[PDB]
Amino acid sequence: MIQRTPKIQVYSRHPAENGKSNFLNCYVSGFYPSDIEVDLLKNGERIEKVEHSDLSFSKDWSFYLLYYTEFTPTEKDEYACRVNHVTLSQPKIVKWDR
């Protein structure tokens, strides 16, 4: 089948400041086909408030879209992008760094 393994990148809009509302961002790109599943994990858990760009597609990048959610950071918390895609054996988990 025609296929392209997604690039995943996780990050926030504005750099980290531990009591101020920010957004958490998972940018998934370069994938084909375009059946994809992306979840943001707040401490191995499943932020049920999560939105995404419309899904776009370019002759060069192929398929790409962004998932974000609002989130006042902390030293405790750890945040992650789970991505599943046909190209990937098991789902990839990408942890929000800084």
Side-chain angles (χ1 to χ4, degrees), residues 1 3-7 9-35 37-92 94-98:
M1 143 202 347
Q3 290 176 353
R4 227 181 147 190
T5 286
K7 158 157 293 191
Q9 310 158 134
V10 204
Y11 65 74
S12 38
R13 194 172 142 85
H14 312 156
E17 274 221 281
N18 316 229
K20 278 103 212 80
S21 147
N22 195 172
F23 277 89
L24 189 45
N25 275 143
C26 190
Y27 190 54
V28 203
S29 81
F31 55 94
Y32 194 99
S34 85
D35 191 3
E37 253 134 293
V38 191
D39 283 301
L40 314 125
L41 311 165
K42 210 250 200 84
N43 291 131
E45 293 170 81
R46 210 234 118 207
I47 313 180
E48 321 163 24
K49 239 243 182 211
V50 174
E51 311 176 274
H52 46 252
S53 53
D54 290 337
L55 169 95
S56 275
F57 174 105
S58 122
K59 150 220 148 13
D60 316 293
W61 319 117
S62 357
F63 270 111
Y64 68 82
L65 83 178
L66 176 139
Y67 293 80
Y68 55 101
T69 196
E70 235 172 48
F71 96 115
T72 22
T74 58
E75 290 310 315
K76 290 226 134 185
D77 277 43
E78 276 187 315
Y79 281 90
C81 202
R82 180 173 75 213
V83 180
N84 217 165
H85 198 32
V86 183
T87 87
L88 304 147
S89 306
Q90 321 70 32
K92 238 183 124 240
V94 211
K95 44 164 83 124
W96 170 34
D97 198 9
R98 42 187 178 191

